[PDB]
Write a protein that binds this ligand. Sequence first.
Ligand SMILES: CC(=O)N[C@@H]1[C@@H](O)[C@H](O[C@@H]2O[C@H](CO)[C@H](O)[C@H](O[C@H]3O[C@H](CO)[C@H](O)[C@H](O)[C@H]3O)[C@H]2O)[C@@H](CO)O[C@H]1O
Ligand SMILES: CC(=O)N[C@@H]1[C@@H](O)[C@H](O[C@@H]2O[C@H](CO)[C@H](O)[C@H](O[C@H]3O[C@H](CO)[C@H](O)[C@H](O)[C@H]3O)[C@H]2O)[C@@H](CO)O[C@H]1O
Ligand SMILES: CC(=O)N[C@@H]1[C@@H](O)[C@H](O[C@@H]2O[C@H](CO)[C@H](O)[C@H](O[C@H]3O[C@H](CO)[C@H](O)[C@H](O)[C@H]3O)[C@H]2O)[C@@H](CO)O[C@H]1O
Ligand SMILES: CC(=O)N[C@@H]1[C@@H](O)[C@H](O[C@@H]2O[C@H](CO)[C@H](O)[C@H](O[C@H]3O[C@H](CO)[C@H](O)[C@H](O)[C@H]3O)[C@H]2O)[C@@H](CO)O[C@H]1O
Lengths: 150, 150, 150, 150
Amino acid sequence: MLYHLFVNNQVKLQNDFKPESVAAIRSSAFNSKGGTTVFNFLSAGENILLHISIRPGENVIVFNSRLKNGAWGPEERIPYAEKFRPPNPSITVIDHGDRFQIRFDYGTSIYYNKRIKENAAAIAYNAENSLFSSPVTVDVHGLLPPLPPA
Amino acid sequence: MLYHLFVNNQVKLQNDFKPESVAAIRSSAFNSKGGTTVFNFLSAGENILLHISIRPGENVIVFNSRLKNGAWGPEERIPYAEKFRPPNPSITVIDHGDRFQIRFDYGTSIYYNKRIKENAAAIAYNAENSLFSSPVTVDVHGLLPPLPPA
Amino acid sequence: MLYHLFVNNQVKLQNDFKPESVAAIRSSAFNSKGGTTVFNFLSAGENILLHISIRPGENVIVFNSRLKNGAWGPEERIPYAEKFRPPNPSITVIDHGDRFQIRFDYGTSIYYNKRIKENAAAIAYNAENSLFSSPVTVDVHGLLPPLPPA
Amino acid sequence: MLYHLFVNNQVKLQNDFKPESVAAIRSSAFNSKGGTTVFNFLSAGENILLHISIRPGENVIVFNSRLKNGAWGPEERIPYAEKFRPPNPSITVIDHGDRFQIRFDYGTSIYYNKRIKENAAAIAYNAENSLFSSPVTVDVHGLLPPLPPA
Ligand SMILES: CC(=O)N[C@@H]1[C@@H](O)[C@H](O[C@@H]2O[C@H](CO)[C@H](O)[C@H](O[C@H]3O[C@H](CO)[C@H](O)[C@H](O)[C@H]3O)[C@H]2O)[C@@H](CO)O[C@H]1O
Ligand SMILES: CC(=O)N[C@@H]1[C@@H](O)[C@H](O[C@@H]2O[C@H](CO)[C@H](O)[C@H](O[C@H]3O[C@H](CO)[C@H](O)[C@H](O)[C@H]3O)[C@H]2O)[C@@H](CO)O[C@H]1O
Ligand SMILES: CC(=O)N[C@@H]1[C@@H](O)[C@H](O[C@@H]2O[C@H](CO)[C@H](O)[C@H](O[C@H]3O[C@H](CO)[C@H](O)[C@H](O)[C@H]3O)[C@H]2O)[C@@H](CO)O[C@H]1O
Ligand SMILES: CC(=O)N[C@@H]1[C@@H](O)[C@H](O[C@@H]2O[C@H](CO)[C@H](O)[C@H](O[C@H]3O[C@H](CO)[C@H](O)[C@H](O)[C@H]3O)[C@H]2O)[C@@H](CO)O[C@H]1O
């Protein structure tokens, strides 16, 4: 399923993003002078299951979770440098049941253990001066599709 | 290369769309009550190498070519019905040197012999009440990529 | 990297199967009346890092590990029924660092925590009356490749 | 549909190779010192619809056709040099109705107008000292599949 997720907006998923699901986010551009860019996977009740806060200025990517009216929990962070590949940077998220796998253009995958046991009903995209395009292309799969030889 | 082509706008290709090139156009939606939707492959001098006029009302898809300040030539047309597959309809265009191959979601390919011997420098998208989303996702290849087993 | 793995034989990998690596095994046939079929991921020292024993007669698929001249460890099982799709069944294995993910044609993935900390140097295929063809096609990737829309 | 085509043998297709069909042939090896290697697309009546003679020693690849007990027609040639990419060279053939498109690893496609109007029922592979592995992996599609971003 293809979705066009606009900045400071979100997309309501046709089906719940759950175990086996794969979300491939791709941007048509890379704005070098962009600021903090955020992607959230939200449950039907608007809980933030997965929070991805890309911070060029602070040189880190922060992962966290939070209930709608709750506080953020401990942060899991990695360095921002050498993760995205211009001019079409991407972000791939896979639900492995007990944890999410997050892959950028470079480096090894990032694994984030699930904190809120609910499936995602929507994906949000927030930024004042986005690092990526608006919208970003989002292809969501119910399971990993057949792979090309290369 | 990924591009986001907005309605009544166009995208300047990073490289010329020429023999072997493949353009995969995908829409995040299908507007059943949409009107005539148009896609043009333009040369650097703005000649319309390939004109694709999808007409739901007239129930036909018309293919043609025209120089910037010239007149349209003879039309090559096929029935509109049962070509697109909602909710993510697509259009694939391949440059085979002496002709273009155009493929929709259903039916056999359409072959259109080249009339203006120039390479395409941009792709335009025009519609008053588009049948597709805005923008549409466009992945352009310099050659056919490796194919998945399915 | 493409390999042709023959029954009761193995293939030596050009590169070590390590974190991020993906192996897509595909069969050109499905012999419904075949017997127990095994696939092993071996280390350079010939330790069996991942043993996949497909037993149609016992209606089960067994996962385990063992040192070259050591004993099998505790078994991890899953039903055999409705996992493979004829006439071209497949098995996909992905190294996630701390565990392997194994996916068949249907159902959820199976996750197997690593027990021997070494990378795989070869993949073996054993059977007297295999459920699959000989050889089976094996495409091995250093990392997940770009994914098609479907 | 996946097939394993062994040298000096052939595979009978489950479906007729016809317009829109695509056959991706891939080798698990490249024997630079091999000799002339041939691939034929045959009709049910065993007419050779498309003959591809790869001759490294003559530095040429020859295309032709001929009836089961008939004579070769006029040859269509292209240089052999820099067409294949080791260690996993490939050959892709697409049926465009009025002609076949043949693509190797490098260079532009070769187009061959159909001379015998029948669909292919089998694909043959012949060689005394093949440039490729035995068997070669062959994935046959009824139509072009969705394409990955790259
Ligand atoms: C080094 C360190 O610990 N710094 C902390 C900051 O990371 C932290 O900033 C917040 O971090 C959370 C995730 O841990 C979010 O990224 C949060 O931003 C998001 O929530 C905001 C409301 O809380 C607001 O809605 C933003 O638009 C949205 O992006 C971010 O503020 C701060 C605050 O907790 O503490 C620092 O110590
Ligand atoms: C049955 C028949 O022959 N009908 C003819 C119409 O198809 C034709 O309409 C024009 O067709 C051309 C392609 O053949 C274009 O689609 C054209 O529209 C486009 O160009 C316009 C300017 O000429 C304008 O810019 C539109 O926005 C753009 O989409 C379309 O008008 C008419 C006119 O030639 O004749 C009919 O006989
Ligand atoms: C219910 C139960 O516990 N059954 C046990 C069997 O599963 C088990 O069978 C062996 O299981 C291991 C995996 O745990 C292997 O699959 C093993 O087969 C392989 O090793 C054999 C030598 O041990 C032999 O080489 C086979 O060819 C090879 O495939 C399989 O026999 C048995 C024995 O451990 O115990 C049962 O209790
Ligand atoms: C420059 C030139 O014209 N050379 C001609 C050769 O190419 C030609 O060789 C034959 O070419 C055809 C294709 O046109 C085949 O490739 C043929 O090989 C195949 O058929 C053989 C029987 O005719 C035999 O069965 C081979 O095993 C099989 O691969 C190849 O010999 C020759 C002969 O036609 O004439 C040259 O003038």
